[PDB]
Amino acid sequence: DLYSRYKKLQQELEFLEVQEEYIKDEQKNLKK
Amino acid sequence: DQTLKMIKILSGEMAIELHLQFLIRNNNTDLMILKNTKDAVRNSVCHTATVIANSFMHCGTTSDQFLRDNLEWLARATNWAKFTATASLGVIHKGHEKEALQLMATYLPKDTSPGSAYQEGGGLYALGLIHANHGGDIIDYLLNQLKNASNDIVRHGGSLGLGLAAMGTARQDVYDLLKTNLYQDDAVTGEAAGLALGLVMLGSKNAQAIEDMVGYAQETQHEKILRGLAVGIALVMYGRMEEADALIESLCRDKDPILRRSGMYTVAMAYCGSGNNKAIRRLLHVAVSDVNDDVRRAAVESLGFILFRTPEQCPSV
Amino acid sequence: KMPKVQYKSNCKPSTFAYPAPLEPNFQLLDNPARVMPAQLKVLTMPETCRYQPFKPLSIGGIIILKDT
Amino acid sequence: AVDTAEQVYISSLALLKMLKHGRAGVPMEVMGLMLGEFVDDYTVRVIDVFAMPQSGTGVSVEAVDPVFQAKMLDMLKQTGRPEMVVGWYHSHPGFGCWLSGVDINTQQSFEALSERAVAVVVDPIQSVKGKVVIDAFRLINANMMVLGHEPRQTTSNLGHLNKPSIQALIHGLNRHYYSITINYRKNELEQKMLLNLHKKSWMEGLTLQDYSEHCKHNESVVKEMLELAKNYNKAVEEEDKMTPEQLAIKNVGKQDPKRHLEEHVDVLMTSNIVQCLAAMLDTVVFK
Amino acid sequence: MQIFVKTLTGKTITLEVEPSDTIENVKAKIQDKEGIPPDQQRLIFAGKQLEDGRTLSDYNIQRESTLHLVLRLRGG
Amino acid sequence: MQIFVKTLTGKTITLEVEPSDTIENVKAKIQDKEGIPPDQQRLIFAGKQLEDGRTLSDYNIQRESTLHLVLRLRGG
């Protein structure tokens, strides 16, 4: 297969950067 | 024949009966675990835990001798436990429709009408579990029974049974009767009415009904009703994805904690199976930052519904 | 009406275990069997019978079984 | 029958009143009465509270005369607040929370006059900057255990979210009385006006801090920075010549230059930035 | 004849009585209706706290008037 | 102008009032025609509870408006 090599890459790119958001907020709340 | 095709394919009572036959003939189980637990019970919580747990093992197997031979031990339970116990019978005879009304009528003490009204109040609930979708005439029967409005225990059990047995139909009469049952503003009727209404109004996104039911929730003294309707106002809204956004943008704006809690269930149920980026983003964000622990629970609780098509993802977060 | 028909597993019996406790690789099955959804793809179709599955087998649920 | 879900709601005003009254009588066990309403069989609200006059025994107190409360309970209704009484409270300073062998007796008649009654207890000296130590209790009849039953038939998880302290459990607790969970009734308006605490006059923001003492403070701090910098490099040289396990002990007796230094840099920068910004704002906003 | 009493819970109580009834007889009737120990209960009317030996007659009470009942209170 | 008071009993009573009328006076009329004393009620109006120091106009109530009424039992 060759089309999935594009779709899965798009999906991981989507899923990553949402990982960034909670960690970014969590470090803020933690010191609070 | 094309005439009987309607029943063969659209009734599908044949399929229900066939599943029943499969489960009854191929019943494999071993009660020895239950007996091993039987002496460990020392309190009402454990007692009810056992009497619910065993029913899971016997789904539709119509097997209940474990109750008959432990009847006097079971008589140790009291109050709401009895409501639960008779309710569990409906699980043991799930399906089994052809005689069901008579079957429970064999044990329903309807002529006695015990001062321990639970003994009947749960029976209607059991009758709902049997007819989880094949309500039909049973629906109207339960509706007629609610016209007695005898006492709020039976009112609770009846609203549960009818709401389950008529789910998703959007039958107008049940919507009417549940409306008038909610407006009583009573702390044990109104939440059960709310739930049953959510059941029968399933997925309708019915705008006027929503505007109706949010009104009482905006202003009531009794928390129980809010703690019930928080589910119903999500359940009516299933799957419409962005069409529901206007509701969401209101609920997450509320200051009352119970409605903020409900917003989570609503955004969960709106986006089931699809990991929409804004849904995950907001649902995860609110868990990190809300002040009330119950909504912080329900927030992360909601993720499973919106992820379940891709199990390999969840451990990453 | 239902017909009496048989199948078998292609695999070690332990995979389809239903022990209820206190080597072949061809264990047969009757008309309805407790089949783990993960292992539907490893049952022997009823190729020895006169009857044939009209629905593509290795799938769940009810099938009409064509006599041939 | 009773249950494991009943919930007590208290207003802010009752809280501040109880704290002040309990803290004033600090060596002894003061008394008071609280009023509200049973909105339903699952929840009870307390809206306001008023003190009571006592003659104090060394151990405890007794309400001196009932004419006082007989007056009060109608004196105020001329100004609304028609609520009936629902419970009482007393404070244990630093002991903990429990019902004594006579507090129970007093609660007996409160319950005999109305079966829904409640008792409340507070700790005004152990409560600090949060976690104010408050609790609520009600008696149970020994009849039920003679049958072998237990009170509070249970249908829900939400009663079991907390554990009693060992000190509370040495005293009677479950073998005589049971606790009820509490939460705080609030509204936005009072919050919106309470947070004004320690707000200050606008003019305070535009003052120039006496340019003659400022330089004196600055070049006072610089001197100890001198005397510390000359002591830093010794502790830099000794960085590794000894076992690190005892290095913690090397701190304990004798202040270290590194940590003790940088707070001076913090002070100097924090002062000298704002002192300079304010002068610019002034030299623009006026003429 | 009959008389009323009320208390700080909003409860009211009604007693069949006669003017010859003593205050201690009243307290006895109250305990018979509700079980309260006669020493924890206290009675007030006309701004005056009651005493045992006097009677409804000498208290100048009249039909269906409402007394106030109040409770003893101590810590310990 | 007309309003309707649906009691918990299901009985709906016709009340004639005006926007200048006050909730205390509607309670008065209620005690008049149904005997029930004025502290034994709560007025729900399918929403927030009514308050007695307020005029009918304050609630924007209009001709033929309908309301439901619940008892206020206290103590026991």
PDB file of C-alpha atoms in Angstrom, chain D residues 28-29 31 55-62 103, chain E residues 74-76:
ATOM      1  CA  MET D  28     -13.241  27.559  76.725  1.00  0.00           C
ATOM      2  CA  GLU D  29     -16.168  25.908  74.946  1.00  0.00           C
ATOM      3  CA  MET D  31     -22.117  27.900  72.466  1.00  0.00           C
ATOM      4  CA  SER D  55     -22.404  31.344  82.638  1.00  0.00           C
ATOM      5  CA  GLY D  56     -19.341  29.177  82.208  1.00  0.00           C
ATOM      6  CA  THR D  57     -18.419  26.200  84.270  1.00  0.00           C
ATOM      7  CA  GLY D  58     -14.716  25.434  84.031  1.00  0.00           C
ATOM      8  CA  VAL D  59     -15.347  22.426  81.798  1.00  0.00           C
ATOM      9  CA  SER D  60     -18.279  23.724  79.732  1.00  0.00           C
ATOM     10  CA  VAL D  61     -21.242  26.096  79.539  1.00  0.00           C
ATOM     11  CA  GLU D  62     -25.006  26.132  79.987  1.00  0.00           C
ATOM     12  CA  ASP D 103     -23.127  16.893  74.375  1.00  0.00           C
TER      13      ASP D 103
ATOM     14  CA  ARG E  74     -25.811  22.938  77.976  1.00  0.00           C
ATOM     15  CA  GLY E  75     -22.532  21.642  76.619  1.00  0.00           C
ATOM     16  CA  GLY E  76     -20.421  19.270  78.684  1.00  0.00           C
TER      17      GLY E  76
END
